[PDB]
Design a protein around this ligand. Structure first.
Ligand SMILES: *[C@@H]1O[C@H](CO[C@@H]2O[C@@H](C)[C@@H](O)[C@@H](O)[C@@H]2O)[C@@H](O[C@@H]2O[C@H](CO)[C@@H](O[C@H]3O[C@H](CO)[C@@H](O)[C@H](O[C@H]4O[C@H](CO)[C@@H](O)[C@H](O)[C@@H]4O)[C@@H]3O)[C@H](O)[C@H]2NC(C)=O)[C@H](O[C@@H]2O[C@@H](C)[C@@H](O)[C@@H](O)[C@@H]2O)[C@H]1NC(C)=O
Ligand SMILES: *[C@@H]1O[C@H](CO)[C@@H](O[C@@H]2O[C@H](CO)[C@@H](O)[C@H](O)[C@H]2NC(C)=O)[C@H](O)[C@H]1NC(C)=O
Ligand SMILES: *[C@@H]1O[C@H](CO)[C@@H](O[C@@H]2O[C@H](CO)[C@@H](O)[C@H](O)[C@H]2NC(C)=O)[C@H](O)[C@H]1NC(C)=O
Ligand SMILES: *[C@@H]1O[C@H](CO)[C@@H](O[C@@H]2O[C@@H](C)[C@@H](O)[C@@H](O)[C@@H]2O)[C@H](O)[C@H]1NC(C)=O
Length: 347
């Protein structure tokens, strides 16, 4: 009997990754969740069944004039097998323009929401939020939830960076020398990476862990995402996009967070006790309702024998379901998957 999980930032914000979570090393009794040394977080599925996830990117940093943009969220339902390992990056909010008392004088600096040394405000853009990522097989991010752009200040210039992206992005015509110099390439970025070139180096405002865009001027850094926000766009165009690999969830819901916060992943257990062959599944708006039904999602009322395989497989092929979407399909003995038409066969 386990409560819903809330995979969070462990008190970390801004550029610096999490350092201390509940568990930092794996246990064997309730192996559960723990923090890796690269800033990602592992979780071992404890019970085979349907899970409802909410995956939210981090919001943009804020300046004395304006609040950052909220991260992007995706809510999905996915069937998970016990002992499967999920690796995740929880995006963190972008930092803010400040000054620090270095030596006996005040230099421009970047300040996170958990900064102990923030007393003086700066008059420039703030940085973008990091995206929030989930990988099943640790070869690509099956889920990317976009982060929000940072707060812009009053003016305009081209001294601003894109957040990180999963896939290629053709940048905006206004992304020139500086923008290309400071734009992030991957979500996992190191300290010296993408400071503003030259004199504006100290004035760099760092996007949050998860690839939040830096800023070097008045514009807020764009949010990271499947494709990063456009620093030159209007409204949500500045914030990152989200995508879910269709090999992971059939019907994900994408929406904008109602709050300016760090990233996080909510994992909900399906708790309704269900009479076989029906299992617990979610269906209302945003999967907020648990119900008993055929795991493939079909009505039990189709025929006298509930949850019967709805496909007739051909020749050298057996009866299967897809490990995550529970989509009915036909495994061909030569490797080939006929999760396809009446037409298709085993070559
Ligand atoms: C920072 O922006 C500079 C200002 O120019 C921009 O104009 C357009 C393109 C738009 O992006 C705008 O917002 C920018 O302000 C960039 O410099 C300029 O770069 C272009 C190439 O992108 C230069 O191109 C000329 O060169 C010869 C002249 O005869 C032509 O062949 C070119 O025509 C085009 O040819 C093809 C037609 O199908 C196709 O490749 C493009 O449509 C070409 O435009 C073109 O007239 C242009 O002269 C130049 N303008 C000025 C005022 O300097 C600047 O740098 C550039 O950076 C990259 C993209 C490289 O191509 C550089 O060699 C080039 O100098 C850009 N910097 C950065 C880092 O982004
Ligand atoms: C999520 O991913 C899929 C593929 O990774 C995207 O689909 C493509 O969309 C373009 C048109 O917009 C098609 O012409 C391509 O052929 C599609 N590719 C594939 C492989 O199907 C989808 O649009 C992505 N969603 C977002 C919001 O980025
Ligand atoms: C998905 O469903 C299949 C059902 O056959 C599971 O398959 C097995 O996977 C492991 C590989 O780690 C091996 O024991 C065999 O390759 C498979 N077993 C048999 C009896 O064929 C698979 O484990 C399920 N889950 C995942 C996450 O892939
Ligand atoms: C097909 O979908 C549902 C079957 O799961 C039908 O509705 C429900 O059936 C049970 C699972 C039970 O939880 C009911 O309270 C629930 O409403 C649904 O009515 C049917 N669709 C149509 C169009 O008839």
């Amino acid at each position: 009997d386990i409560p819903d999980l809330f995979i969070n930032t462990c008190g970390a914000s801004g550029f610096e990754q999490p350092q201390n979570c509940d568990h930092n090393r794996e246990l064997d009794g309730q192996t559960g969740h723990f923090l890796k040394e690269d800033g990602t977080q592992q979780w071992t599925v404890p019970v085979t069944g349907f899970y409802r996830m909410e995956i939210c990117g981090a919001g943009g940093g804020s300046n004395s004039k304006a609040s950052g943009d909220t991260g992007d969220c995706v809510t999905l339902q996915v069937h998970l097998i016990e002992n499967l390992s999920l690796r995740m990056l929880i995006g963190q909010m972008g930092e803010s323009p400040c000054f620090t008392e270095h030596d006996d004088e005040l230099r421009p600096s970047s300040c996170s929401k958990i900064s102990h040394n923030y007393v003086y405000d700066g008059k420039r853009g703030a940085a973008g939020g990091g995206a929030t990522l989930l990988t099943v097989e640790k070869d690509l991010w099956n889920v990317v939830a976009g982060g929000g752009a940072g707060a812009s200040w009053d003016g305009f210039d081209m001294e601003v960076g894109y957040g990180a992206s999963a896939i290629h992005v053709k940048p905006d015509q206004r992304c020139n020398e500086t923008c290309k110099a400071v734009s992030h390439t991957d979500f996992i970025v190191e300290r010296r990476d993408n400071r503003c070139p030259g004199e504006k180096g100290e004035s760099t405002v760092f996007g949050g862990f998860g690839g939040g865009g830096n800023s070097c001027g008045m514009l807020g850094g764009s949010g990271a995402g499947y494709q990063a926000g456009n620093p030159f766009g209007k409204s949500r165009a500045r914030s990152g996009s989200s995508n879910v690999s269709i090999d992971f969830s059939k019907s994900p819901i994408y929406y904008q967070s109602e709050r300016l916060d760090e990233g996080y992943i909510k994992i909900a257990f399906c708790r309704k006790r269900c009479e076989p062959p029906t299992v617990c599944r979610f269906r209302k708006d945003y999967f907020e309702e648990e119900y008993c039904g055929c795991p493939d999602g079909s009505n039990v009322t189709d025929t006298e024998e509930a949850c019967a395989f709805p496909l007739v497989c051909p020749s050298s092929s057996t009866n299967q379901y897809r490990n995550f979407t529970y989509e009915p399909f036909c495994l061909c003995n030569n490797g080939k998957e006929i999760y396809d038409v009446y037409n298709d066969t085993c070559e």
